[PDB]
Amino acid sequence: KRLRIGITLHPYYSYVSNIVGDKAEVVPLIPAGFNPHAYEPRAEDIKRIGTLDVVVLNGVGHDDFAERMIASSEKPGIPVIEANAKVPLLAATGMAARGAGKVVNPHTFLSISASITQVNTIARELGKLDPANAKAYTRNARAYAKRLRALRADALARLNKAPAADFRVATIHGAYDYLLREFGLEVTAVVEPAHGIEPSPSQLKKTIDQLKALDVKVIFSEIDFPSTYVETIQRESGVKLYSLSHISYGDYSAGKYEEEMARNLDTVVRAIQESG
Numbered sequence: 149k150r151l152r153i154g155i156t157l158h159p160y161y162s163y164v165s166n167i168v169g170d171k172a173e174v175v176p177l178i179p180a181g182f183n184p185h186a187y188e189p190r191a192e193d194i195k196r197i198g199t200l201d202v203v204v205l206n207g208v209g210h211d212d213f214a215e216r217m218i219a220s221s222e223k224p225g226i227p228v229i230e231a232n233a234k235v236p237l238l239a240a241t242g243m244a245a246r247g248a249g250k251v252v253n254p255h256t257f258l259s260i261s262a263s264i265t266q267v268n269t270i271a272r273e274l275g276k277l278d279p280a281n282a283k284a285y286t287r288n289a290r291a292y293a294k295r296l297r298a299l300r301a302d303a304l305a306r307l308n309k310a311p312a313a314d315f316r317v318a319t320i321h322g323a324y325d326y327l328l329r330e331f332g333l334e335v336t337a338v339v340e341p342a343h344g345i346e347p348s349p350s351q352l353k354k355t356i357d358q359l360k361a362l363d364v365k366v367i368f369s370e371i372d373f374p375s376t377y378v379e380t381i382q383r384e385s386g387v388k389l390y391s392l393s394h395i396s397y398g399d400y401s402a403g404k405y406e407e408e409m410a411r412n413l414d415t416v417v418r419a420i421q422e423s424g
């Protein structure tokens with residue numbers, strides 16, 4: 149004792165740290181500065197799972213590497229918190245065609261409302277494991293949710309007018325479908341054919357031709373692990389470029405999620421305000 153809680157992605161470090169405080173230890177599975185899309189399990193990181201009591205998973209497609217790390221560890225039967233067990237999932241593409249047709253968008257963590265649902269699931273499941281700190285977990289979860297709710301409200305407060313009917317939005321990476329739904333907006337197109345997959349020159353050309361035909365106004369690119377082909381899209385479509393954070397780069401911290409979500413929500417507001 150204390151509880152040793154494993155995490156996979158940076159947003160989950162933030163949720164858990166804000167729920168536990170000093171009552172437990174938040175242990176990242178994979179190193180800081182690693183790209184979760186590129187990550188291939190290492191004996192190094194698999195060997196630390198044996199020191200944990202519970203692992204908090206996204207479990208809906210953004211941390212399959214962790215399910216394999218646990219399976220290859222000293223604790224293959226380690227208690228697991230399915231953080232998205234009560235989150236309604238969007239079925240955004242793709243995962244391609246001749247692999248898996250229509251799948252689930254695993255970026256629930258890039259939503260304020262689905263974040264609050266995840267925070268509540270984690271605080272309840274940790275409460276069941278650590279009954280002595282169940283009250284503190286719940287108190288801290290409610291207070292974190294109030295700050296997440298205020299973050300969204302204060303960002304939307306900056307929006308004078310709703311986007312026009314012709315306001316179409318595209319993204320490089322299919323991470324922002326949940327974020328944009330907070331504005332009542334839909335992503336017209338995703339450039340990546342499947343999650344974390346680079347398009348072929350022919351696939352990129354077809355997409356550029358679709359952004360031009362569909363009159364897409366703005367494109368949301370990556371700050372974290374940027375792509376080489378975004379300037380080609382700029383050079384061929386005449387679409388305005390804005391960048392968003394996937395909350396996957398740098399050091400793990402409690403504040404990281406709310407710091408980067410505030411910047412994301414302000415970038416989306418700036419993109420709307422700059423449409424008129």
Ligand SMILES: [Mn+2]
Pocket residue numbers: 149150151277278
């Ligand atoms: Mn304990």
Ligand SMILES: [Mn+2]
Pocket residue numbers: 227228229230273
């Ligand atoms: Mn559990």
Ligand SMILES: [Mn+2]
Pocket residue numbers: 166167288289291292
């Ligand atoms: Mn808090």
Ligand SMILES: [Mn+2]
Pocket residue numbers: 240241242243252253254322323342343
């Ligand atoms: Mn996707």
Ligand SMILES: [Mn+2]
Pocket residue numbers: 255321322323343344394
């Ligand atoms: Mn992703």
Ligand SMILES: [Mn+2]
Pocket residue numbers: 329332333334
């Ligand atoms: Mn919508």
Ligand SMILES: [Mn+2]
Pocket residue numbers: 324325326328329333334335
């Ligand atoms: Mn959408």
Ligand SMILES: [Mn+2]
Pocket residue numbers: 241242338340341342
């Ligand atoms: Mn696609």
Ligand SMILES: [Mn+2]
Pocket residue numbers: 346347348349352377
């Ligand atoms: Mn390419």
Ligand SMILES: [Mn+2]
Pocket residue numbers: 357358360361
């Ligand atoms: Mn065309």
Ligand SMILES: [Mn+2]
Pocket residue numbers: 320369370373374375376378
């Ligand atoms: Mn990019």
Ligand SMILES: [Mn+2]
Pocket residue numbers: 400401402
């Ligand atoms: Mn910290």
